[PDB]
């Protein structure tokens, strides 16, 4: 799917949606295949702390017609 | 590379066909085909699912069945042939109606049920006493080694329903005609009507080469394929007849099965190139009476490998509506090419190659090419017949100058 | 039975061209067409414009099986 990712966004669970967007950077980890992204947290995470984040992604062209052809009266 | 895939569906009218035809299906699986055996009545049958084809080849050893199970229909088998699948059909005196409708949609007209091919002169000594097991002479076998195999064949045993190729259909392949004496009728019942087929018009095996290059063989006899006729000896019942130690049924069945499933006679057309002779690339338009080289590559499937084609007799045409030039392409440098001078006439011409030969694939290639009149810069200049007309104007301008000199200063 | 008549009035025979007129009334001839039901055999209807003002047909490719179209 990495070829087809149109958008990726992340925000912390919280009402300030316009401000709770986190900064994301496309990143490559050494020796591993695929795209990766680094997300900077607003506050560091201590040993034994936790935080809830929401990841939103949109893929394109990933729905392929099957059958590839139809008449007027057939459905898709 | 098999030019159709191995996925083969077998339709049987009874499962004992798989035991009685074991040598054929062995001699077919040993070519790497991937058979599946289903009863022709089975409701789970289908060829198309979600618009794709589930099988590349179909074998309908189901003579007696009145209807196919599932969504299989003569309309569906027609759409399968139009999809480019290869089909094998074997009839018999039990011939059910939908096989006759399938023939009628192919243009091969099976006779009525209960009918048989009869031959009172070439019935085999092994006949049950009805003169319907006929020894078809290989003199009748089509003169097409791609179809029938290049080796010689002993006589072949047939017992089944004669069929007539509709003269209206040009593509029909008259593979094995009945004898001049054979005919098809109800053996018990007197000949009140005119027979459906009589003499050499009776076909025992007929083929089709569709325009999409689909292939169909309708055999009039299932028993033809049986291990019985593969193992049986053969001897005409009339006296003075040799006994042959084996029938030619097996080699012919193999060669037919190779043909149907695109194992022989498959041809391909590769790149086509045309350019002005001495150039490396095609111009946008050629001029009247330009000199052009045309080159094409044609390939053949041998043992599943593509190889440069051997054929000698390929003809190029240069066509506007009717053909203006037709000439043999020479085999040169691994390619087929010819050099020729374009006709005196401008227009939107087409190069054509139309190698249509019996049993080989119908190859068609066309490239549209506009031929334009001369540019005004290319017309002939300084014609020495016209020197007097040049010297005229180059006299007049000099007289004018000298006159302009004298007139003002006299 | 000519080609042009068959191209113009294909399916048209069932159109309610007017409220006071029977189906298949032609606005220009002021006549109910005579041959209402037929099939085209070598043309398929590619596009008919919203008001049917312009109609374009695709000339069917040669039959795949060598059957005749009759």
Q: What is the DSSP string of B174-231?
A: EEEEPPSS-EEE-TTS---SPPSEEGGG-EEEEEEE-TT--EEEEES-SGGGSHHHHH
Strand partners of residue A76: none
Closest CA to A67 of A75, A59, A55, A58: A75
- Give the burial string for B36-74 (b: 16+ CB within 10 Å, else e): eebbbbeeebebbeeeebebbbbbbbbbbbeebbeebeb
Q: What spatial distance separates the first Cα and last Cα of chain B, rounded to whole Å? A: 99
CB within 8 Å: C66 and B107: yes
Specified resolution (Å): 7.6
Helix (H) or strand (E) holding C49: none
**What contacts B339, CB < 8 A, 6 or more positions away?**
B277, B291, B292, B293, B294
At residue B106, what are phi and psi to the nearest 5 degrees?
A: -90, -20
B52 close contact with A: CB closer than 8 A: yes
Q: How many CB pairs under 8 A join B and C?
A: 31
Give the per-residue SS3 of B286-329: EECCCEEEEEEEEEEEECCEEEECCCCCCEEEEECCCEEEEEEC
C-alpha to C-alpha distances, B149 to B200, B248, B253, B263, B394, nearest whole angstrom? 22, 11, 10, 12, 81
Gap between the Cα atoms of B296 and B308, Å rounded: 11
Gap between the Cα atoms of B150 and B143, Å rounded: 10
**What contacts B380, CB < 8 A, 6 or more positions away?**
none
Given a contact as 3+ CB pairs under 8 Å, which chains touch B? A, C
Nearest CA in chain B to A69: B51
DSSP state, residue B281: S
C67 vs B contacts (CB less than 8 Å): 105, 107, 169
CB within 8 Å: C68 and B210: no
Strand partners of residue B341: B291
Gap between the Cα atoms of B78 and B90, Å rounded: 17
Closest CA to B265 of B377, B346, B358, B388: B358
> Gaps after which residues in chain C, C–N over 2.5 Å?
none
Chain B residues with CB under 8 Å of a chain C CB are 78, 81-82, 105-107, 168-172, 208, 210-212, 214
What is the residue-wise DSSP string for B85-101?
Answer: -EEEEE--TT--HHHHH
Helix (H) or strand (E) holding A19: helix A17-20
C-alpha to C-alpha distances, B231 to A33, B159, B234, B362, C52, nearest whole angstrom? 62, 15, 10, 36, 69
Gap between the Cα atoms of B202 and B407, Å rounded: 105
Token pair recorded at residue A47: 């040993």
Q: Degrees (nearest 5) of the Cα angle B321, B327, B331?
A: 135
* Residues A25, A8 contacting (CB under 8 angstroms): no
DSSP state, residue B363: -
* Residues B90, B204 contacting (CB under 8 angstroms): no
Q: How was this structure determined?
A: cryo-EM
B51 close contact with A: CB closer than 8 A: yes
The residue written with tokens 């319907």 in the block is B132
Chain A residues with CB under 8 Å of a chain B CB are 66-69
Determine the residue among B46, B48, B49, B51 to mutate to test chain A binding: the one whose Cβ has the most chain A Cβ atoms within 10 Å.
B51
- Give the burial string for B289-307 (b: 16+ CB within 10 Å, else e): eeebebbbbbebbeeeeee
DSSP state, residue C64: S
Determine the residue among A67, A74, A76 to mutate to test chain B binding: the one whose Cβ has the most chain B Cβ atoms within 10 Å.
A67
Helix (H) or strand (E) holding A30: none
A69 vs B contacts (CB less than 8 Å): 51
């Amino acid at each position: 799917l990495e070829a087809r990712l149109a958008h990726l966004g992340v925000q912390v669970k919280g009402e300030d949606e316009e401000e709770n967007n986190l900064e994301v950077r496309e990143t490559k980890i050494k020796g591993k295949s695929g795209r990766f992204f680094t997300v900077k947290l607003p506050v560091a995470l201590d040993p034994g702390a936790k935080i809830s984040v929401i990841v939103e992604t949109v893929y394109t062209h990933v729905l392929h017609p099957y059958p590839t052809q139809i008449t007027q009266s057939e459905k898709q | 590379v098999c030019a159709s895939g191995p996925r083969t569906l077998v339709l049987l009218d009874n499962l004992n066909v798989r035991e009685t035809h074991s040598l054929f299906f062995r001699s077919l699986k040993d070519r790497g085909f991937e058979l599946t055996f289903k009863t022709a009545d089975d409701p789970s049958l289908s060829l198309i699912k979600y618009g794709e084809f589930l099988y590349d080849n179909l074998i309908i050893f189901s003579p007696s069945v009145e209807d196919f199970g599932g969504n299989i229909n003569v309309e569906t088998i027609s759409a399968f042939i139009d999809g480019g699948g290869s089909v094998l059909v074997a009839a018999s005196s039990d011939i059910g109606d939908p096989l006759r409708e399938l023939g009628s949609e192919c243009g091969i007209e099976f006779d009525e049920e209960k009918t048989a091919v009869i031959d009172h002169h070439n019935y085999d000594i092994s006949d049950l006493g009805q003169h319907t097991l006929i020894v078809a002479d290989t003199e009748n076998l089509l003169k097409a080694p791609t179809i029938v195999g290049k080796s010689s064949l002993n006589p072949i045993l047939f017992r089944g329903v004669g069929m007539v190729a509709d003269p209206d259909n040009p593509l029909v392949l008259d593979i094995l005609t009945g004898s001049s004496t054979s005919y098809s009728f109800f053996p018990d019942k007197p000949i009140t009507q005119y027979p459906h087929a009589v003499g050499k018009n009776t076909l025992l095996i007929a083929g089709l080469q569709a325009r999409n290059n689909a292939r169909v063989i309708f055999s009039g006899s299932l028993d033809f394929f049986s291990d019985s006729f593969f193992n049986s000896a053969v001897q005409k019942a009339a006296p003075g007849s040799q006994r042959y130690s084996q029938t030619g049924n097996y080699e012919l069945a193999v060669a037919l099965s190779r043909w149907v499933f695109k194992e022989e006679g498959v041809l391909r057309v590769g790149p086509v190139s045309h350019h002005r002779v001495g150039e490396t690339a095609p111009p946008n338009a050629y001029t009247v009476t330009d000199l052009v080289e045309y080159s094409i590559v044609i390939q053949q499937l041998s043992n599943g490998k593509w190889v440069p084609f051997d054929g000698d007799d390929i003809q190029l045409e240069f066509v506007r509506i009717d053909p203006f030039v037709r000439t043999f392409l020479k085999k040169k440098g691994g390619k087929y090419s010819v050099q020729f001078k374009l006709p005196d006439v401008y227009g939107v011409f087409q190069f054509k190659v139309d190698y249509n030969r019996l049993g080989y694939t119908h190859l068609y290639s066309s490239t549209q090419v506009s031929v334009r009149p001369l540019q005004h810069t290319q017309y002939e200049r300084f014609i020495p017949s016209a020197y007097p007309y040049y010297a005229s104007a180059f006299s007049m301008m000099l007289g004018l100058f000298i006159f302009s000199i004298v007139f003002l200063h006299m | 039975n000519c080609l042009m008549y068959k191209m113009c009035y294909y399916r048209f025979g069932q159109v309610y061209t007017e409220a006071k007129r029977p189906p298949g009334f032609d606005r220009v001839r002021n006549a109910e067409i005579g041959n209402k039901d037929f099939e085209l055999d070598v043309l398929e209807e590619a596009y008919t414009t919203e008001h049917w003002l312009v109609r374009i047909y695709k000339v069917k490719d040669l039959d795949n099986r060598g059957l005749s179209r009759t």
